[PDB]
Design a binder for this molecule. Sequence first.
Ligand SMILES: O=C(O)c1ccc2c3c1cccc3c(=O)n1c3ccccc3nc21
Length: 256
Amino acid sequence: VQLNQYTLKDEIGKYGVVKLAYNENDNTYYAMKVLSKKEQVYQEIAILKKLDHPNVVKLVEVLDDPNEDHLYMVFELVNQGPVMEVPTLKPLSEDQARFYFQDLIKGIEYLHYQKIIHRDIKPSNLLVGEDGHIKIADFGVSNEFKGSDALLSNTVGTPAFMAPESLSETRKIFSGKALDVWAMGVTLYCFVFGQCPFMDERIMCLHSKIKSQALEFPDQPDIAEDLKDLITRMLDKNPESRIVVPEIKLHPWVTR
Ligand SMILES: O=C(O)c1ccc2c3c1cccc3c(=O)n1c3ccccc3nc21
């Protein structure tokens, strides 16, 4: 309940778990990510210490004790929590989705510029702050790359948001930026339909679906044709032809 200057409170999110924490001698609330030691965590920290943008969470301090089994990362609190939960019977309106998607674009553009591939973009990792804007959270599985892009081979992140080129049975190499774009696409889809476009309780089937099922649109809710086009481009199963962030930024539906 007490970590030096911090007073741990209830859980607000959940690898590991996040709790509301009160900072005495500062008299302010913070978000405390608590992890039980049971080098990735130090890569997350390294990545975070390098990020400063209004649409990305902000690491404030790390409490590591070789003696203690627990490790704590304190972040500035993004008070309103997840923009939405999936699934949900109450999707967002187009205008709401565009608003948030714009923040997501700004944040992703920044992360890619800083040579960071998030690898876990989804509605639940987009927290709404005091001013109503989104902040990308949970870099627990992100990668840092040198060069123009990342050349990856590992399969990490949330199943329903994984890109098809990362689900080969042969462990092939694939581009990193395109992975985030694909996840942004599944995310925009969730924004207005209230559920993922590819589902299956059997992992290997989901993989097959993500890789082979053609994108389908529920006739209800009804969405503008330009939005269906944007989503279709972001969910292009071929990485080489999938729309890139610079283009998304200038798409009719986004600038509309
Ligand atoms: O970066 C992270 O891993 C992370 C994960 C979750 C949260 C957070 C994370 C990182 C920084 C901040 C938060 C955060 O403020 N919250 C929440 C606030 C209200 C309701 C739920 C919340 N969940 C988080």
